[PDB]
Amino acid sequence: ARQVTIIGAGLAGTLVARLLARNGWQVNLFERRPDPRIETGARGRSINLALAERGAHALRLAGLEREVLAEAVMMRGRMVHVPGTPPNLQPYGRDDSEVIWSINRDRLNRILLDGAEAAGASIHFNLGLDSVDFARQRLTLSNVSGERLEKRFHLLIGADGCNSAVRQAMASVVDLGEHLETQPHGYKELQITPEASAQFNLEPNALHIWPHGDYMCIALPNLDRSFTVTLFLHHQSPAAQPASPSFAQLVDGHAARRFFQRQFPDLSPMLDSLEQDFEHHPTGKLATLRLTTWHVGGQAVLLGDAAHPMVPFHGQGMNCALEDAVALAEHLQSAADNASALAAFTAQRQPDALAIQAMALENYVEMSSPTYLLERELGQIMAQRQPTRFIPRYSMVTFSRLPYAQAMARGQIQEQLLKFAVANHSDLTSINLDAVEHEVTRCLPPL
Amino acid sequence: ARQVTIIGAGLAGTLVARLLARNGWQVNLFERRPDPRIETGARGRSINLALAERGAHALRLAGLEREVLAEAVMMRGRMVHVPGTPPNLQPYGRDDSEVIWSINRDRLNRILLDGAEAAGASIHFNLGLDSVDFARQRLTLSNVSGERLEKRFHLLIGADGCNSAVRQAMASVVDLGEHLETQPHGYKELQITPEASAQFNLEPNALHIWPHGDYMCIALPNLDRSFTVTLFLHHQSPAAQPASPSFAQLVDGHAARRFFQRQFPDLSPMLDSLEQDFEHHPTGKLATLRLTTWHVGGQAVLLGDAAHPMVPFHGQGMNCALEDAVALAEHLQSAADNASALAAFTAQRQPDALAIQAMALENYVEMSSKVASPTYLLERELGQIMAQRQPTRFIPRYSMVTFSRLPYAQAMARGQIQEQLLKFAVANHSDLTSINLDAVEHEVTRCLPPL
Ligand SMILES: Cc1cc2nc3c(=O)[nH]c(=O)nc-3n(C[C@H](O)[C@H](O)[C@H](O)COP(=O)(O)OP(=O)(O)OC[C@H]3O[C@@H](n4cnc5c(N)ncnc54)[C@H](O)[C@@H]3O)c2cc1C
Ligand SMILES: Cc1cc2nc3c(=O)[nH]c(=O)nc-3n(C[C@H](O)[C@H](O)[C@H](O)COP(=O)(O)OP(=O)(O)OC[C@H]3O[C@@H](n4cnc5c(N)ncnc54)[C@H](O)[C@@H]3O)c2cc1C
Ligand SMILES: Nc1ccccc1C(=O)C[C@H](N)C(=O)O
Ligand SMILES: [Cl-]
Ligand SMILES: [Cl-]
């Protein structure tokens, strides 16, 4: 039986552990954190995530989809909140088949851990990777208190997140050709209780957004009617606009409260613990990191956030990481050797990871807020008339398994076609709809 | 009138002498060598240099550009000689306005000497600087016979080259924070006569390169159709590769001939005096020398090769030295005092000199390996499309350095963004037809601000 060591019992690491173990591999998985299945007297994390068709299909192949979806809330559309105006619901599709699922991160992780152990994987918690000796095929792990221990390895999988220790170790033996692109927005996680969401009639079966230009809030629902809110705001005010809101200006919870009362007036009354949440939860960092290569011969490979950190504005990081886990297990299972498997996995996934990283950056403007309204109106008519040809980019990314690079290329043809059709036209009445449709049939092959 | 003493009537020294003298400064310029304008029975042999936009603009400001260009050969592009295919011409840019000029060193120096004297500078030849007493504000000079003489000075400019005597003297009063980085390649100059270049149809209006990985040849044309071929090759073979070519393995001219016949077959028949040139011309040494400071209060400053020796792989040493002369004259003319001028000149120029020193080291792989690589060819093709679509955002690094006056550090920083963008766009793609050009252009607009 072939041997493998995986670092990081997160989302990609735990899924790939189950896929390899059920195919007869000897799997050992190491995780820095404690086992979340061991109940303690501590609170429990409220982190939520949007699970889309790519992630759901990966779980389906692993035989875990039904168990995960039993604990997920259906989001039928986007609820856009602009002050004074009643919240406006934008459905995703025509029926409940085109939906996004809101899943609690730690509930999903527990299901994945049980799934990996049921398949035969051995999981070791409270052990963080410190360094790797590639020549000697040994690695060094330690607990939170610094006690160190060495382990021999044959194949190493880095599923250890955006600040991957496996990626750092690989830099000693290969040039990963890394390029880090910082993002000016930080993030802060806040909470809405079940009592507060019911009192203010906040729709449970929707994804909520409070656009505000250079800053915004989003909220995802939980099974118990509570919601997890995320604030996206610049860490610092730029030199050109020193008066503009930023985390630096919000000195404490009371400053944060005054900011929410002014800028998010319909949201502030639902955040009962705003002051406490603001001071106790740390401000998160966002970035895009692109690598030239993801592997070292047949010895080590990266996947998920360890290979391609992206900005969270398309809700696709976990979905991409689960898609990566399926592809890595498929290549490893049937290749001539580990070196061939790792090079083939990198060649397949790199162009698709680059495409979603680019589309996620673009999506910030679409979430944070007449010509666009005209193009949207025309696009909707084309989608209704040619459903196998004109498919909005958001739908190709969220509700299909079309490779990310293909969704990006087709979306470009669609945008170009809409741009020329609307150019130097005030409204829809001056546009020949049949001529635009003929151009759709002329430029977009059916899928 | 403000007084200044300059050491070295080279390229930077003679230009700064004209700029200061025409602005009313009392200028005295000291040079170790004899006056090259005095005709003797000796046979003078100097190389041709590549003059680009930075150097040409400096001469333009000085009113000397037309005189220099009348004696220069136009290089409309690069002629790459890769084994297995005929020589291929790569035009320099968008139009024939983006050219490099091949100018004889001695001819340029003579024009600069005439220009400095016309502006009022006094030039004293056959006097080499030996030492400086900074406390006493005196310096010591000598002739070749050894007779020494002292001179008082007020402001001292060190324009005295790679082995600067002013820089050595400054080490007695300040920590220059020097760091010397040796380079493994040596160099040898070889000749192509006007008869041989015409016989073999070698293009006169181009810069020629013969890439060969760890070694290579280059050739620049002269006004008379002769060319100087420079061979860049390791002094010694490394321990890991003892069989690899090196100067140590070429004991005599006959060994050099066999090497050229095997590895540069299209070049060997043009080098009639190969054997003689190899044995009589010494092997040159290459290096990068970096300093943290270039001045001593308001008393002395370095510029050109005296301040920043660099490897010759980007043809920018003279161009950088002439750019330094314009900046030094600008700071000295307008500052509150000499101390403020020298500190401001060093703060402005030191980061730009560090950037061209780094880009010159990087240009060796570009010329010797990348030019013959299909991935570089696909990258160049994609880069050309981006340059057409976004002309104020995507400007190829070679063009920013050679055909513009953008500060070298800015050309390097923007160049890194462009290198990464092209690398990720072409990765896992065989040709241009599978690349989403609009997606690449969006990365350009997001990452590169317009200039
Ligand atoms: C604000 C925000 C919102 C998001 N929303 C969404 C969304 O709606 N939908 C979506 O698809 N994605 C979303 N994402 C992205 C998503 O959270 C990640 O892309 C995903 O968790 C990556 O999965 P992974 O398994 O690669 O890494 P992770 O889930 O981060 O797992 C990495 C694991 O490695 C462990 N580890 C780390 N270092 C070591 C070490 N040295 N030794 C041992 N173990 C180690 C960690 O403890 C962890 O268990 C969001 C991200 C953010 C920040
Ligand atoms: C192989 C090679 C190829 C090159 N090709 C190019 C090219 O194509 N393009 C380009 O831009 N650059 C090129 N360069 C670089 C270029 O030659 C130099 O960077 C340039 O000459 C520096 O100008 P400078 O005025 O600072 O010094 P220099 O031109 O060297 O002048 C220094 C002067 O000081 C005098 N002097 C020295 N010591 C004393 C002393 N003690 N007392 C008095 N006088 C003294 C010298 O005699 C000389 O006249 C090349 C260099 C090499 C080695
Ligand atoms: N004149 C030189 C002397 C020596 C070595 C290079 C040059 C160059 O000018 C190279 C040119 N800048 C290039 O990139 O092709
Ligand atoms: Cl995400
Ligand atoms: Cl040079």
Short mmCIF file of C-alpha atoms in Angstrom, two decimals, chain A residues 177 179 181 290-292 347 350 354 358 361-362 408-409 412 416, chain B residues 417 420-421 423-425 427-429 436 438-439 442-443 446-447:
data_model
loop_
_atom_site.label_atom_id
_atom_site.label_comp_id
_atom_site.label_asym_id
_atom_site.label_seq_id
_atom_site.Cartn_x
_atom_site.Cartn_y
_atom_site.Cartn_z
CA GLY A 177 8.15 31.90 -8.23
CA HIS A 179 4.05 36.86 -6.17
CA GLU A 181 -0.62 41.01 -4.16
CA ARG A 290 0.20 33.21 -7.13
CA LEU A 291 2.93 30.48 -7.49
CA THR A 292 4.87 29.34 -10.60
CA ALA A 347 -0.74 21.58 -15.15
CA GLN A 350 -3.08 26.17 -12.31
CA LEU A 354 -5.55 31.84 -11.86
CA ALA A 358 -8.98 37.18 -11.13
CA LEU A 361 -10.97 40.48 -7.40
CA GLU A 362 -13.48 41.73 -10.07
CA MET A 408 -14.02 33.46 -17.69
CA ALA A 409 -13.45 33.17 -21.51
CA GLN A 412 -15.72 37.84 -21.94
CA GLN A 416 -18.15 42.21 -25.51
CA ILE B 417 5.04 43.58 -12.29
CA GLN B 420 5.13 38.24 -13.43
CA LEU B 421 2.03 39.18 -15.49
CA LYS B 423 4.90 34.55 -16.95
CA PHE B 424 1.50 33.59 -15.42
CA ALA B 425 -0.40 34.44 -18.65
CA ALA B 427 2.14 29.24 -18.25
CA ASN B 428 0.56 25.93 -19.48
CA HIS B 429 -0.17 27.43 -22.99
CA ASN B 436 -7.55 35.14 -23.21
CA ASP B 438 -8.75 40.57 -22.66
CA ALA B 439 -8.08 38.88 -19.26
CA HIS B 442 -7.46 43.59 -17.33
CA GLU B 443 -4.43 42.53 -15.18
CA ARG B 446 -5.48 46.73 -12.39
CA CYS B 447 -1.70 46.46 -11.67
#
